[PDB]
Each structure stands twice: as structure tokens, then as C-alpha cells.
Amino acid sequence: GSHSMRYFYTAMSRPGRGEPRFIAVGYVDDTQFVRFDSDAASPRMAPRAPWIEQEGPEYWDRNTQISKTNTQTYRESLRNLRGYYNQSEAGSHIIQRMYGCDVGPDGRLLRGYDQSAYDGKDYIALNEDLSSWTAADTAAQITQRKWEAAREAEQLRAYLEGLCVEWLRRYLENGKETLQRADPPKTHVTHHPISDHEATLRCWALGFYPAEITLTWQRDGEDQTQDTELVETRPAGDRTFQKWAAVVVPSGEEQRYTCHVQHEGLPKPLTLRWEP
Template identity: 60%
Template sequence: LRRPCGSVASQPLLVPRIPLPEEFRTAITQPGHPEPRFIAFGYVDDTQFVWYDSDALAQFARASGQFHREKILTNHHPAFSRGAGLSERGGIRSTRLIADLVPGYHSIQSMRGCYMERDGRFLSKYYRTAYDGMDHISLNEDLHSWTAANRVALITQDKYETTGEAEHHRPYLEVTCMEWLRSHLEKGKEILQRTDSPKTHITHCPISDHEATLRCWALGFYPKEITLTWQLDGEDLSQDMELVETRPAGDGTFQKWAAVVVPSGEEERYMCHMQHEGLREPLTLRWGMIAGLVLLGAVVVVVMCRRKLPGKKGVRSVA
């Protein structure tokens, strides 16, 4: 979910990290294949620690990413494998139930997890699914009843209530989820509690003779929470800028950018403000000002977007 991005001055610096374990599972039906393919990933505090694929030669879950490189978890992760196998059968039941009604390629995706307060108390727990990329059904807070997102999901709800599907998820959400969280926080604390400062730069891409796009980048940072905001002469531009969701970089860190369209020749009036746990104080970037941009360990590079303007043969050079 997108976090609201208002004025940097009016926002708290950053909310404290609340660790959580999450599982993302997908079952896919394919015409001509008797069994759906099942894929699962496990995350702790936005960091992937294990994966499972029913099409893999080895039918067990494997540690992944930094958890694998640092040998924090063994490649054979029996608890996740057992859970993946149980969920695979559940996913197969769900996909077959719908595929029988609508033949073809279909997918059931599910995610479940729990949030914990810093004092160790449960904050919340959840289980919800999507069918062909659309919200489908979710387990209510009481961990007994279901909420269907649409009419198609009512079929699944009836089936789940008849078969007692909630019983399969309750032990994990009430007990196992917290046990896994505490275990992985202890085993992977050097990874999960680290701080990687963002590497930053601003790109300048002319879009006409009169306008250009300034894009403020933050790369290679951890944890995930970060704030990017453009300002014009000190005035907040959060309503006029394009802001992408924070994205995983594939190496255990994250990346994000915010862009604003500006009149050509007025670029230096615009400033990008950045807040992250890895910065001792907010970072301010301005296009065209090279000196002083290396701040608080953040590597700052200013790059000119080499884009040919209409009617011109040359390209703009690096500032």
C-alpha cells in the first residue's frame, strides 16, 4: 500500500520498524496439466528468506538471498517445506474448484502473516487470497469466518465453511507465525536490523523545448521505509509529482524515485527532500549543484538523460 507523502516538514521522521513474517503463495492451473504449479516465498521484515517451487527438482524449500549467502538458514528448510506442501494441497483444491467452472489458465494467490509490537505482543494477523489477480476471499480477525470480495468468491466461501478451511490456518497464525518471527529475528538479526543508506542521484530528461523531467532516485537502501518529496522554493509539490512504490532491488535492498515536470531553465528552483533511517538528518538534493551533495554517506551522482530533442541533432551532455 502506498504511504501518504505530504510535506517533509509535517511528517514524522520515520515510524519505528515493526518486524513481520509473511508468506506469498501461488497455485497456477494450466490446460493439459493434471496438477497446478505451486510457488511460495517467505519474507521477514520485507527480506526474503526462503522459497519453494513444486516444479523444482528438489521438493523442499531453500534459504534465499542474504539468508542463503550468510548460511543463516540451511538450504533444507523442513518447516517451510511442510507448510508449503499443506498449502499446495489447499491451493490445488481452490484452483480446481474454480477451474472446473471456468477452464483455462487460472491462478490463486495467497498471503498470510503477523505483525508484532516491539514488546513481543501480537499486533495483527491475516490471511487473504486473490483469484486471477483480483481480491477473492480473506479470513476475518476472529480466524473462524470469511469475507468474500465478490460473487465468485461466495462459491469459495461456501466450500471453505463446509470443509473447515479456517482450521488449517489458525495454528499458524496463532502460534507458528510468532515462533518463526522470533526465531528468524534472532538468527538473521545482523541482516534484518542493519541499515543501508540510500545512494542518490537526480536525472534530467528534456521532454520538449520548454519542459524537462527531474527524477530524484534513492537506490540500495534498507530498511524499506523512506520519504521522497519535491519542493519548489520551499513549497511542497507532493500533489504534482509522480511517486512510484518502493521496489525490491533483488539484493536485499530497495529503490524508489519521485519525478516532477519543470519549466526549462528553472531547474535549480526545485529541491528533492529525502528521509531515511540511514541518514542522520534529511538529505536535500538540487539539480545542477554538485558541490556538497555527498552527505552522510549517501553517494550522490547527477546524470543528464541523453535524449535527443525534436529537430535537433545533438544531445545534451552530462552536467
């Protein structure tokens, strides 16, 4: 199907405990492939997936230099935003940024993203036109005027339509045996009695990649949305993900319930029931 590349920047101040820490991680779809940590004994952009290891010295040196520059730029930016909100020098604050591109099955740009947050709240976002800005408040308006004056959107657009798309296509080819392989969920249904009156049916999915999945319970063919305990999809540690959905049913009505599973690894969607 379609694919994404994203970089996630976290910049965190810590007054009294040194200068602010800057972390960058890069992903293709749900696969992390690089990291940088300004707290590391020797800070550098480092591989976190096997298919990136073949990149040469120019790549690692460029990505390391930009990240080290970013460490300084984000430190100044944290000082700036503290001023914009009249905040004390004693508190710890966070700038987060995520940017990247989505491409379709033919590798064509579907859209680009660049969004920032400050202490967990929307701060400023590049619009889908990759030309204009949305500032969340009068503090972010100061950033917006700085960035318009510097023609930042034009630089972000060049990257999002240029390098981001080109390198994503390159990564997808170098890592095709994993990045372009969908592993279907292994599924099963369990039955845990609660009382003489009801029991829990839990519908499991294990070992799937990527993380996107749809698990739903129906009773007499009707989705039990309000009645389904959905757990957050979770990583197994081997690149794959796990998920379950649970519904509480009256004893003896178990056969009126079906679990439905949609995942791009699956030849066709799955319908499951409890098999005692």
C-alpha cells in the same frame, strides 16, 4: 521499528501441460528467505537467505511435507473453484494466497492476515478479528461455508498468534545484522535540459533497505504531487532498492525546487536541490 513475515502461495493450472504448479515463497520484511516449487526436479523447501541455513532437518522436513501436501490441496481447490464459476476445463486459472503477521518493536502481535485471490481478484479474506470471513461473491461464500464448518479461522488464528510471531522473533534475532539494519539511501539530483524553456530535475535514491521510502518534490515549499513522475521502487539485486522522482521545471526556476527524502536509515530527513 516494526517487522513482518509473509508467505505468498501461487497455484496455477495449465490444462494439457500437466498438473497445476504450486509455488511458495517466504519473506521477512523485504528479504526473501525460503522457496518451494512443485516443478523442481526434487521439490523441497529450500533456503534463500543465509540466516535460515542453520535451521535443522526437522524444520526443512516439516516445511517440505506441508508444501507437498499443499500442492495436492491447491490442485483440488483449483478444480473446486472452476466448478464454482461454471468454467471450462480448457482455461488456465490462478489461486493466490498471502498470510502472515506484523509485530511491533517489542515483538508483540500487531495484526494477522490471510487473503486469497482467484485470477487476480479478491476472493476471500480473514477479517482482522481472526475469527470471521469476507467473501467477495457467491462462489467465495461456498468456500466460506466449507471453512466455517471446518473451523478454519480458529486454526489460522492459532498460527498467526502462535508460530508466526514466535518464528518471526527467532528469524529477526538470527538475522539481526541484516534484518534489523536499515541502510539509508544515497541521494543526488540531476538536471537534463528538454528545450530552451524547461529541464528535468530527477531526484535519485540508491542502496537503501528496506524498500519503504518517501521522495517528494516541492516548489516554493509546496508538494508537486500531480507534477512528479514517481518510478516504482525497484530491487538492485544486492538486497537494496532504488527509486527516483522527476519534475519538469522552467529554465531559471531550478532553485525554487527542493527534493525531500524520508527513510528509516536516515538520522534525519534530507532536503536536496540541484547543485550546478
